[PDB]
Ligand binder design. Sequence first.
Ligand code: HEM
Length: 291
Amino acid sequence: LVHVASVEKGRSYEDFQKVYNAIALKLREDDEYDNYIGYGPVLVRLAWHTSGTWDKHDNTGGSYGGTYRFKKEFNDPSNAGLQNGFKFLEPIHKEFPWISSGDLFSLGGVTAVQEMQGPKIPWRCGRVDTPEDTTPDNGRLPDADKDADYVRTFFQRLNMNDREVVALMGAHALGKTHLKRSGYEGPWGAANNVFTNEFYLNLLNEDWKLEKNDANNEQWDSKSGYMMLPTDYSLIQDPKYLSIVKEYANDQDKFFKDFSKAFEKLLENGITFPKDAPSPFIFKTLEEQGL
Ligand code: HEM
């Protein structure tokens, strides 16, 4: 299966900037969600989970088809809690019904990273909604109880290398684990709705203890009130991942640039962009627009 990007009829940069702005303004307005974390982190995770079902071997799953709108995928246990991001985007989709579901879900992630002061993420339009029978089965999203070998093997299915994996994982600065959603509890740091390299600094600098949470699952905890999943912690157990963690801990700009590339790639996996497609768009933030 080849998924060819097809621009929403007649639409151009300014149309999508309006969509970006509506998501950004809602993000500002609906500030109370998740004990005042706001929707930014769950939107980044929604973009990732809608993309991360991709299999490079047969081009199944991925962001193109916007299949999270179908029950099989919205009810994936791995997706618990993402319904809050979907609900957030519903009025956006009502206002701008011309946008495809995959374009909305990926653009939600981009908007969220940028509004939270993260890097600019170039984004391309043209995802097309595909039918319910194209929904990928549950179980393509990764488990958190596993080791570095698991992580490395897992992400080969998404055509990601060590650098790309370590860079992507830095999104775990954002948000938190919720015991009832995933069996893990706690934030990864202090700045959990601002996009920084804190995930890496915390890995290296905090004094981590291996504990059991109230779900009887092991996680790494610090006295500052932070946590890491076992798959997070695996990035400092494995000597290849560790070198990269150290690099991002010591160079904010490099983390930003590599994250931006890896996240755009994640979001575009599976999609064939024709040769005369528009160039990727770089959206202005609300701050840059004086809005
Ligand atoms: C080994 C790969 C990964 C595993 C096992 C994993 C696992 C998890 C788990 C268990 C949670 C907690 C969910 C909850 O209880 O609410 C979570 C949260 C999150 N993950 Fe991942 N994750 C991975 C990779 C990524 C990547 C690649 C991204 C994006 C680039 C990402 C973004 C997020 C975000 C933003 C949250 C916070 C969501 C919220 O606060 O509602 N994760 N992850």
